[PDB]
């Protein structure tokens, strides 16, 4: 008769959830990647054959764990910096004298403490209108978010450079990497490869668009857990990047005042030259062709209908505009200059300029309070990046029309990393296995 036998080190796996860790390359960075374990120049990657695995990025726990890890890293990075709670005072703001955005900047003066608690000082500084709100409702003002939570100034020594970090799994577990051509968010993967650690995932922070992200290999990829549902975010991946360049013409001069014992506060001293508005540039031909390709690829999911783009849904400035992290400065660009066109079934530089605004007080994770005061960057600052993904959002009413409206929104921070972790999933290998055969042990 048949008998059962146990097999050790058998090649099977099951879905599970584990705690990953950083594996960046060879601390002062905002992500503290130097403290984590070093990377491996030759990653352990083994190809597979005749294997099918059900992938679902919308249900994996890697993005939810990465979001918490990034939040913890950010909180621990801003913890040892100087607290700016005594600065919540009354500011007597006037205009910028119109040196010639001559209205955005405001020249404010206020009282402040110093090294000696007995003595005080009066200093002047330049601030943006977006970070200033009136208190008397009509001369004198008060900072924004100051009435809700304390202000913390980011340490000028740290850098906000999105250096890549490698996410590895502990022993006894493996990461399944999918290499299928044109693989969307869900569906079974035929070309599966096993790797010990993820690739160069760059934790870039952006919204309404993706910068310095991954790209497709053959055609435009559209991802959504439910394309028929308008409430679901439609993440689209580009096959080729769209270059974008930005510049901040305001030649800033950073000054410093020592408030309290030892710690100091950095502000803007004076602007060299004429006041100018910060903006960004993008080629019209490249963006137009990209929009045409995206509309053509998205037309399949909604039949032979016309596609129309709108300029956001309105509301808060942080959820209706862009958000950059170029050199530590945060830019809020007006996206209305891009998603303004219509497309039909039938179908020189001339770059498109995008006006952008800058805010020193920010809360990237949209949490209630705990805002961070970004110190001003001295001198002119330039930035260049590649556009790889668009965070579209379906909008419609009766839905029986011949046209559809797509607005760039989403406003979810987890959607940024979800566009890069679509090829991975964590599994738990079970070396113990049983199978029947014909043999009997000795006695």
């Amino acid at each position, epitope marked *: 008769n048949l008998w059962v036998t146990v097999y050790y080190g058998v090649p099977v796996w099951r879905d599970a959830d584990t705690t990953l860790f950083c594996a960046s390359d060879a601390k002062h960075n905002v992500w503290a990647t130097h403290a984590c374990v070093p990377t491996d120049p030759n990653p352990q990657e083994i190809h597979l054959d005749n294997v099918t695995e059900k992938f679902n990025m919308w249900k994996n726990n890697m993005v939810e764990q990465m979001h918490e890890d990034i939040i913890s890293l950010w909180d621990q990075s801003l913890k040892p910096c100087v607290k700016l709670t005594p600065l919540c005072v009354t500011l007597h703001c006037t205009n910028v004298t119109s040196v010639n955005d001559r209205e955005g900047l405001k020249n404010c003066s206020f009282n402040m403490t110093t090294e000696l608690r007995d003595k005080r000082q*009066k200093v002047y500084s330049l601030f943006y209108r977006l970070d200033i709100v009136p208190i008397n409702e009509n001369s004198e003002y008060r900072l924004i978010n100051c009435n809700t939570s304390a202000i913390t100034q980011a340490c000028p020594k740290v850098s906000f450079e999105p250096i890549p970090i490698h996410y590895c799994t502990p022993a006894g577990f493996a990461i399944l990497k999918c290499k299928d051509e044109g693989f969307n968010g869900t569906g079974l993967c035929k070309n599966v490869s096993t790797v010990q650690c993820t690739h160069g995932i760059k934790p870039v922070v952006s919204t309404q668009l993706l910068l310095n992200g991954s790209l497709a290999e053959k055609n435009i990829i559209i991802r959504s857990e439910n394309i028929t549902n308008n409430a679901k975010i439609i993440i689209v991946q580009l096959v080729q990047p769209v270059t974008i360049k930005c510049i901040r013409p305001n030649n800033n001069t950073v000054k410093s005042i020592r408030i309290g014992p030892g710690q100091a506060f950095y502000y803007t001293g004076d602007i060299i030259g004429d006041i100018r508005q910060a903006h960004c540039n993008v080629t019209r031909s490249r963006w137009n062709k990209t929009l045409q390709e995206v509309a053509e690829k998205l037309r399949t999911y909604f039949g032979n209908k016309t596609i129309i783009f709108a300029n956001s849904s309105g509301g808060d400035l942080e959820i209706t505009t862009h958000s950059f992290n170029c050199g530590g400065e945060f830019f809020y660009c007006n996206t209305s200059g891009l998603f303004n066109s219509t497309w039909y079934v039938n179908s020189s530089n001339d770059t498109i300029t995008l006006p952008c605004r800058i805010k020193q007080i920010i809360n990237m994770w949209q949490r209630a309070g705990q805002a961070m005061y970004a110190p001003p960057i001295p001198g002119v600052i330039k930035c260049e990046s590649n556009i790889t993904g668009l965070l579209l959002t379906r909008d419609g009413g009766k839905d029986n029309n011949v046209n559809e409206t797509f607005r760039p929104g989403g406003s979810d921070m987890r959607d940024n990393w979800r566009s890069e972790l679509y090829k991975y999933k964590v599994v738990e290998i079970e070396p113990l296995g049983v199978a029947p055969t014909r043999c009997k042990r000795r006695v």
Partner: antibody
Amino acid sequence: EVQLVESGGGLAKPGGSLRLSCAASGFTFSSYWMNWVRQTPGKGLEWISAINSGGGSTYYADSVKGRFTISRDNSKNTLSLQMNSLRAEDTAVYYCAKVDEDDYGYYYTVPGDLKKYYFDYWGQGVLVTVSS
Amino acid sequence: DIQMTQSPSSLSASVGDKVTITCQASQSISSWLAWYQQKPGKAPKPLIYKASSLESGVPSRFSGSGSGTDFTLTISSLQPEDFATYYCQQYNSAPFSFGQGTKVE
């Protein structure tokens, strides 16, 4: 140059009252201290009052302590001095002056103290006199 | 209170003649003192920024010196104008008292 004028002087009766006004332009009036001085015939110039940027913590000399009052209007960019219980020897050409260094910097209790100033701009003083 | 003393009260001069004006301080004022010039019928104007500093807008011909309690206003009198009453005022003091006033012609 900085424009500074004053007016409001005229004849008065001993023991009565009189009000003076000083106008300023061409500079941030809400960022500099203001002082009042007199010029008697023969005797040199004598300082009689001072005022900070905010308006409070007024300073006065012993010869006019409790008799004169100084005030200013930041919104109107004007300075005023009130005279009460004036006597015969109070006649002189009252000049409206402005300090050179601003009030920005370290301070003890008022943004303008702890700093040593000196009069820079002197307006065209008005004559105030009394008689029987 | 503190009070200044300036001498000589009056002295005659001419174009190119060498003269000098000085003032003394009863208490120590280190170097907090400024000089002023005032023509008859015209408001006084600053002349000396600090004990060893010259006020802006004033010609380089004028100069001065002094420290502690004795200060002397060096005037070569080469220029034909500015023959008015010169005042020595001591700042850094409660009454910011001025000098007696010295006129040169």
